[PDB]
Design a protein around this ligand. Structure first.
Ligand SMILES: COc1ccc([C@H](C)NC(=O)[C@@H]2CCCN2C(=O)CNC(=O)c2ccc3ccccc3n2)cc1
Length: 225
């Protein structure tokens, strides 16, 4: 049981879609479609398995004010769904610094246990974006050891949530050409801009999946082939 991205091409690259019990990271420049894929996943996860979802709820942690509840409505309506119910099934939190971002993962644990054995459990946790607060707050050579200690602890908490509660953790990371915030991820996907409103996804760290690329479009339905 995997969460469809909305793109048949990007799902085949991922072996069916985004996995639970894993952290799936997309990285790329600004504008490559990371936040759009996250918004689509927040909707897709609500669908029944036959339509590409997991009959679940989504949690969205927003570190840069990128969350657009209207965009969720747009995606839901164009896919034949109630924009109201789609919004009812997404838990949302704005993280204003890296300490708040870390506490939210701890608090997400409480929300997940509660729904764990119900009809619509949480199935997706989004962190958009994972690193930005760490880059901006840990300033100077004197702060780099603590920066990695906190980033490492934060990824350990996310891995633990994913395994405990059988949820997909989807994180976005803004890697620019051209400063390195190393961190663990189960799956890494590089996004870049393509021909017009197309985007290209490349598998970077994928243990046994065949390497390769996939093309997808940003449409009114979220992400599409
Ligand atoms: C009509 O316009 C809208 C605008 C936005 C929405 C969004 C989608 N819904 C919400 O904001 C809903 C409804 C009001 C409170 N609320 C929450 O989700 C409150 N969330 C939390 O307390 C919380 C706590 C810890 C978390 C840790 C990780 C991730 C998420 C977390 N969320 C709905 C309608």
């Amino acid at each position: 049981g995997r969460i469809s991205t909305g793109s048949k091409s990007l799902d085949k690259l991922l072996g069916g879609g985004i996995e639970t019990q894993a952290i799936t990271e997309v990285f790329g420049e600004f504008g490559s479609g990371k936040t759009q894929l996250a918004h689509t996943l927040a909707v897709m996860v609500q669908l029944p398995p036959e339509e590409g979802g997991l009959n679940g709820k989504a949690m969205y942690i927003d570190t840069e004010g990128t969350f657009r509840p209207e965009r969720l409505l747009e995606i839901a309506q164009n896919r034949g769904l109630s924009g109201s119910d789609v919004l009812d099934n997404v838990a949302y939190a704005r993280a204003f610094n890296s300490n708040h971002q870390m506490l939210l993962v701890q608090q997400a644990s409480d929300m997940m246990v509660e729904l764990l054995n119900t009809d619509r459990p949480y199935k997706l946790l989004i962190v958009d974006s994972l690193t930005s607060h760490f880059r901006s707050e840990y300033i100077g050579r004197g702060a780099l050891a603590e920066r990695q200690q906190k980033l490492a602890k934060h990824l350990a908490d996310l891995h633990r949530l994913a395994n405990l509660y059988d949820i997909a953790v989807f994180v976005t990371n803004q890697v620019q050409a051209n400063h390195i915030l190393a961190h663990s991820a189960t799956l890494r996907v590089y996004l870049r801009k393509g021909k017009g409103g197309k985007r290209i996804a490349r598998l970077i760290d994928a243990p046994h999946l065949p390497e390769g690329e996939a093309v997808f479009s940003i449409t009114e339905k979220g992400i599409e082939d």
